[PDB]
Write a protein that binds this ligand. Structure first.
Ligand SMILES: Cc1cc2nc3c(=O)[nH]c(=O)nc-3n(C[C@H](O)[C@H](O)[C@H](O)COP(=O)(O)OP(=O)(O)OC[C@H]3O[C@@H](n4cnc5c(N)ncnc54)[C@H](O)[C@@H]3O)c2cc1C
Ligand SMILES: [Mg+2]
Ligand SMILES: [Mg+2]
Ligand SMILES: [Mg+2]
Length: 299
C-alpha cells in the first residue's frame, strides 16, 4: 500500500504465515511435513533456549543478514518467534527496528546489495553494513561492529550443517578464539535445501531474483554461476518441480502486507542473459550436495 509495514505488522505477518504453513495437511513422507518439523525445531531453539537468555529487544542480539535464501527464511522464522514469544505467549520484557548486520564486500552482487536494501525497508531492519571498500576478514569486520555496539552478546546466523564447515556447529555456541567474543545463534542448522525452498516459496515474500535465474548459492560476483545441474537442454531428462503446491497456494497478502517488486539488477541481468544457456530457477534443485555447484573452476 501507501506505506511500509511497521515492525509489529511484519512480525505478525511472519507469525501468521508460519502458522499457516504448520497447518498444511501434508503426508508423513513429504517435503512439507519435514519442513514443518524443521520449523518446530527452530522455534524451540529461539523460544525455549534463546530469548529467555538474551534479549532480542535491547540490542543484546543482532541478526546477520545478506539477503540470501537461508538467512531470509531464518529472518521470517525469527520475526514469527518474536511475535509468538511476546504477544502470543505473553513473555516478560516499543521496538521499531530489528538490529541487523551485513558484512559488505567489493565483489558482492549488485542484485544482492539492492535486495538487502529493499528488504531492510520491508522488514524494518536497522541495518549496519560494514565498509565495502575496506580489506578486512569477516572476523575483523565483526570486531569493528562490536566496538560500535558493545551491548551485543549474540548474533543470529542462517548457516546450515550442509554448508562448508557446518558439520560440527551447534545451535548456541561461542565464536572461535580468533574471532571477537560473542555467542553464535544458529537455529537453522537442521534445514536442508528442499525445506528452504518449500517454506520460502509458500511465504510469498520477495526472493532475491538471482535464484529465479538459476543460482542456488550466492557467493561473490566472480566465482558464482547459475547451477550447471539446472541447465536446460534438449537431450537430458527435464526437471520436475517439487514446489508447485506451495507456489500455487502461497500465503495471500492484503493492502498492508503486499510486496513491492525487487528486480534483478541490470548489471547482473546482462551477465546472465549473455550466457548462451538457460537455467531452471534454483528451486528445481533439492540435492544439498549440489547446492554449491555453480562456481568457476579453480586450480
Ligand atoms: C556472526 C557470525 C559469526 C561467525 N563466527 C564464526 C566463528 O567463530 N568461527 C568460524 O570458523 N566461522 C565463523 N563464522 C563464519 C560462518 O561460519 C560462515 O563460514 C560464513 O558466514 C560464510 O558463510 P558461507 O558463505 O559459507 O555460507 P552462506 O550459506 O552463504 O551463509 C551462511 C550464513 O552466514 C551469514 N552470512 C554469510 N555472509 C554474510 C555476510 N556477508 N554478511 C552477514 N551475514 C552473512 C548469513 O546468516 C548466512 O545465512 C561466523 C559468521 C557470522 C556471520
Ligand atoms: Mg546459505
Ligand atoms: Mg557501505
Ligand atoms: Mg552464500
Amino acid at each position: 500500500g501507501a506505506m511500509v509495514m511497521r515492525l509489529g505488522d511484519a512480525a505478525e505477518l511472519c507469525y501468521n504465515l508460519t502458522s499457516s504453513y504448520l497447518q498444511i495437511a501434508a503426508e508423513s513422507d513429504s517435503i512439507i511435513a519435514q519442513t514443518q518439523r524443521a520449523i518446530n525445531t527452530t522455534k524451540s531453539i529461539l523460544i525455549n533456549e534463546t530469548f529467555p537468555k538474551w534479549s532480542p529487544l535491547n540490542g543484546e542480539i543482532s541478526f546477520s543478514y545478506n539477503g540470501g535464501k537461508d538467512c531470509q527464511v531464518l529472518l521470517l522464522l525469527y520475526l514469527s518467534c518474536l511475535w509468538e514469544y511476546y504477544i502470543v505467549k505473553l513473555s516478560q520484557s516499543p521496538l521499531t527496528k530489528l538490529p541487523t548486520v551485513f558484512i559488505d564486500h567489493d565483489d558482492t552482487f549488485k542484485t544482492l546489495e539492492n535486495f538487502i536494501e529493499e528488504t531492510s525497508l520491508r522488514y524494518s531492519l536497522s541495518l549496519y553494513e560494514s565498509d565495502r571498500d575496506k580489506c578486512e576478514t569477516m572476523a575483523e569486520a565483526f570486531e569493528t561492529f562490536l566496538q560500535v555496539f558493545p551491548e551485543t552478546k549474540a548474533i543470529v546466523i542462517g548457516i546450515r550443517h550442509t554448508d562448508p564447515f557446518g558439520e560440527h556447529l551447534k545451535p548456541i555456541q561461542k565464536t572461535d578464539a580468533n574471532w571477537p567474543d560473542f555467542y553464535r545463534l544458529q537455529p537453522l542448522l537442521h534445514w536442508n535445501l528442499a525445506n528452504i525452498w518449500s517454506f520460502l516459496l509458500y511465504s510469498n515474500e520477495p526472493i532475491c531474483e538471482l535464484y529465479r535465474y538459476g543460482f542456488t548459492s550466492l557467493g561473490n560476483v566472480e566465482e558464482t554461476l547459475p547451477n550447471p545441474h539446472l541447465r536446460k537442454d534438449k537431450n537430458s531428462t527435464p526437471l520436475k518441480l517439487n514446489f508447485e503446491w506451495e507456489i500455487e497456494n502461497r500465503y495471500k497478502h492484503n493492502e498492508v502486507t503486499k510486496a513491492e517488486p525487487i528486480p534483478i539488477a541490470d548489471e547482473d541481468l546482462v551477465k546472465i542473459e549473455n550466457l548462451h544457456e538457460d537455467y531452471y530457477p534454483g528451486w528445481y534443485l533439492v540435492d544439498d550436495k549440489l547446492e554449491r555447484a555453480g562456481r568457476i573452476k579453480k586450480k
